[PDB]
Amino acid sequence: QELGNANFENFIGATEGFSEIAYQFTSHILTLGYAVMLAGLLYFILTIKNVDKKFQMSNILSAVVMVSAFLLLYAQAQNWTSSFTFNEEVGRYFLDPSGDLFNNGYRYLNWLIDVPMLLFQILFVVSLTTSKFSSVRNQFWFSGAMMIITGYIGQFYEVSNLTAFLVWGAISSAFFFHILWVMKKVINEGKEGISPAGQKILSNIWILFLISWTLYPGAYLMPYLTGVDGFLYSEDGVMARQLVYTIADVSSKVIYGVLLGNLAITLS
Amino acid sequence: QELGNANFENFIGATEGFSEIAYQFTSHILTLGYAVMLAGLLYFILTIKNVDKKFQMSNILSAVVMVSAFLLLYAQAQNWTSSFTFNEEVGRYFLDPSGDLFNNGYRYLNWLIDVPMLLFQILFVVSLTTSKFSSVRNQFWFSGAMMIITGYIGQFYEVSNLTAFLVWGAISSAFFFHILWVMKKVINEGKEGISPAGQKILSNIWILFLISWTLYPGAYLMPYLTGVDGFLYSEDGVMARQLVYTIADVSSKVIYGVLLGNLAITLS
Amino acid sequence: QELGNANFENFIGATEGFSEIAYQFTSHILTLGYAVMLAGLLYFILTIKNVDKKFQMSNILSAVVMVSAFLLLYAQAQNWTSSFTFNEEVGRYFLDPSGDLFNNGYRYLNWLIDVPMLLFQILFVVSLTTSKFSSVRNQFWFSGAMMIITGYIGQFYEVSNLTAFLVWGAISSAFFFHILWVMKKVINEGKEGISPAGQKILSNIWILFLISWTLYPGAYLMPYLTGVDGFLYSEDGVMARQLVYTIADVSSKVIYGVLLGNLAITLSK
Amino acid sequence: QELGNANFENFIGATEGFSEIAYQFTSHILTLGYAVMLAGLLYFILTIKNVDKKFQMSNILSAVVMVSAFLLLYAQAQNWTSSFTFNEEVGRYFLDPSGDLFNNGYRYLNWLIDVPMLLFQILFVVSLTTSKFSSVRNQFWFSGAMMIITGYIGQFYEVSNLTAFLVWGAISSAFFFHILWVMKKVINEGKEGISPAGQKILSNIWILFLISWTLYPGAYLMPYLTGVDGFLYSEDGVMARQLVYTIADVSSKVIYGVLLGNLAITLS
Amino acid sequence: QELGNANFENFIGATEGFSEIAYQFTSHILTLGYAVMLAGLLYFILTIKNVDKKFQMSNILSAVVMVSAFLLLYAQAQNWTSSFTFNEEVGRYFLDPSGDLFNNGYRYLNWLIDVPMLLFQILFVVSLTTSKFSSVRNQFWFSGAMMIITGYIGQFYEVSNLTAFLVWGAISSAFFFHILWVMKKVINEGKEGISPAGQKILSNIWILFLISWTLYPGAYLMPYLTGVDGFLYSEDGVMARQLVYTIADVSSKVIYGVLLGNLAITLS
Ligand SMILES: CCCCCCCC/C=C/CCCCCCCC(=O)O
Ligand SMILES: CCCCCCCCCCCCCCCCCCCC
Ligand code: NA
């Protein structure tokens, strides 16, 4: 069977197949994913009037991200269930090519919305002391775009060409480190001239940002984190990857948005 | 045939099949389920301005839960109809593997939204006395998560491994008892310093909470409540399980939310 | 072919099949059905601020009913088209078992929302005199639930067991008569102490309620209203049943809601 | 092949089939149709507060019509694509019976919403002089209903029985002429006691009403407007019918609604 | 195989087929497309109260365009996935005629909404000096309609008849040049008598308009921009065409709308 430049989920699905637990769990975690985003959308719209006019752009950009996340995770949930079909003889779900191959790439291109907006929205709550608003925004947007596009190219080769996969991943990581650098500056300048309560929240935001954003490259490498022919190059790795994505999505978008809202309230 | 770690609905559907009444009833009760949640969503949004600003977070969290419940029950209703197909020769609906196996697990993972939010929202209406807000919240959220996750693991073995099914269920019950304990404290502290009218409503809320939340473990054990090869290990048990879930869902989310709203009005 | 405890639509569909007119008409009337409910939802939300705060719960409960009706009629419309497939050799639509058997039961269980809310909402516009609010509400809700549940059980036997069908229908009718009784009291007490304009509207509401609610038991008996092998035990009866349901749904929910809104306006300052 | 009392689209689709242009164009025009209605819905809701309270019922009834039109045109667009399937051997789309026969009847029954509401809404903007509000409303609603129902019956026989088709069409036309008569009176009385600017708009509304409403009977006769076995009794007539419907739908509902709104602003 | 007057995507899909990257990328870019439009819809509605009453029509028309774009790009995304199916023997996606042929024509007919509204909305923010409002509007609407209709006819022949394709394209370009002419005048008159800030934004709007609108004819010619049997007459050209459309859609509708909103704020 010829799959070409396809994600490893298809190789596991085409050879070993997926147990009821592996298939159902992946279906459930992706379903919880889009449910959280639509719930978040409602929360961000309904709490818009809870902060001063100047901070409301944060709620609006959170809502924008929720729409992106909901549509993508909904599409990705349908893509999962249509790509793997139950075989009654062996009692496992195997690649059903009529449903198309499964691809994580859907997520990557929608990050062209999420990443720029998530980085932009904090600049509407915090006050910079040294750094220029337009300069920070432009660095976030340029590095964000390059990080996503290079990673998008890389993930197509996660099985067909391990070398390209790692090189593109490495280039992508360079832009990621730059984003972490600039965000650290923004957090530090943001802490200057606000109440200790506000400073505590910004500290929490930095930890959340650091861990949640790092999970994405984790999901990228997931199948190989226990090396070639490891425990994770199986249905277990498939489950782990989608679980990690869902934890990252909720943390980086919904919880991040809630914390920014709480900061906005303390500064109001 | 080989089903593996699948819910008992699939075993009944694969062997005996479902009569028109059993199949249609299950379809109708799940349809009523999601209809009630979307109707509730509209009610909670439209009555937001009927309570003082400080109580409006209760309406908002009810709305959040309604979105979760609607999406899940809608998906679960489609999963039911796609998993069982009519056999014209015998006049019964049999497992159709091309629609995937039916799994109640969808509900469990969405409880990661419902349970934490349902427990949290009462803390925006009642005033604690001796207990700390953050302490009660953290206990609810930790015990809630552990209760759900342990039960989620257990239900995959309700047929393939009765021992694992009961052990995980037992561990889950421990966390359930802790939640009941903390909620009892919250209700008692909540009754302190409010009108007898408010105290009457809180008393009703406690009864509703107790009965409605107990129905869930009831649904878990349903197939075995009349022992192995009992009256309930049949299409009758399948009907009973989904009926009990629907009664529990409407009571625990919609009716609970309405009572909290009425309490909020009394305190306004 | 073995169908069991199935609605008569499936027996006609499995034996005679449906002409283009019968199949298309049923599809069109169910489509109009859900379209009216979504349009009504928008109307009730957009006119909320046209009445005093105390009457706004009427608009809200109308909206709640519209959501229920829309979702159910939309589902029922899809169920119809998926259950009957065209046979090119004879030019008729026949039962397609892969789409599931057609069942009217979907409606019945959603009435557990509609009936209680429709009866409850009038108590937010009219003022009772000799009757207690909680007492009337409880009678409406208990009798409403029993009426629906008994009818739901009955309709599964409309072909497989005519006796069970009629017995459950009869029991259901008892609870229906009780509802009509209580509603009559509510209308009379509602007329007391309001302008003749308001009394006129309440009179219209009573007529609408009486006719529209009676259509439902009419739809129940439809296949047998011309006897066991009659004109109506055909695709004509299938068309008639869904037509009557749609007329009853629009009248009992949408038009009823509009009249209550107009009453609320007349009582408003 | 036996089709019975079916629309002529099915006869062309079953014999000649449809070229890529004919099939795609019909799909595109119906898609544009429902897109316009959802866009209009948004416009009528967002401009509600642009007119005095007394004229807002016009926006509300426009919105009601948009919901009707959107749902129907969306359904009709799906019905078209599911009823005709590509034959790779000859490169044309042929009747696919598994998708059901195509029927324009969907439109007719939804006119039971559109026609009464479109006629009613003008009575909330203009002031009658000689005529009674209730009398005009009742004539519009009775004649509207009879016009639609008689036409609905007629269109089922547009191929199977040309005589019935024309007789029902003729009876329907009688009720149409009555509506045109009453609307003319309403326009004239509406012009009395308003600014020349308002009178100009009412003049435009009358022209729009006359042309747009006449297109519907045009669509009815379309297949026979060049006689039996004419140029239009082909895929060309199929294209022309759906094009004319779309032009009529946009003009009679959306543009009509906009003009009434502009009149309401002039009178505010 | 006989395709007739079909888009070149179908010819590549029927002969060479599409690699995983080509098929997935096209699916991802179209998905990002509709996601951006629904996110934009939310942004334009939520920021309506950020500008003076007289400028709010701009937000409303942006919202109207977003509804059009969302519905069309959503439909086009579904059309793409249903028209090409994976062949497990060769590992490529081939034309699946049961899903209908793919056609870009969907976009063209929805431009009958987008183009007129995009050109109209700027006239609600800028003040004309020498030019008459009604005159400019009428020229935009007439030339817009003719540009779209002529291009719509042309694209059906992009493979079956290269001559017709180029002639209709040329006629269409004439109307395009007229639009560019009128828009240049509007921008110049708009710049007269407003703040430096306002003039800067109008300058940006003109550049964005010029580049973004030119991309559309670029997408039209895409398959032949490297001559007959060139590098772009392949799956690479298919990818490039949909990519260019998506860049043009986001720029011409969303970014254009945001800039107009920012101009409205500076003038408020
Ligand atoms: C598929 C159904 C899911 C519906 C949920 C989608 C959410 C989109 C937002 C809609 C609700 C927001 C309405 C604005 C709040 C009104 C404020 C108020 O009434 O006080
Ligand atoms: C591929 C590009 C994705 C970007 C589009 C995201 C969705 C549209 C939302 C628009 C975002 C606007 C950003 C705010 C502009 C700041 C202007 C200042 C106002 C005071
Ligand atoms: Na599957």
Ligand code: NA
């Ligand atoms: Na089924």
Ligand code: NA
């Ligand atoms: Na069908």
Ligand code: NA
């Ligand atoms: Na087709």
Ligand code: NA
């Ligand atoms: Na495909």
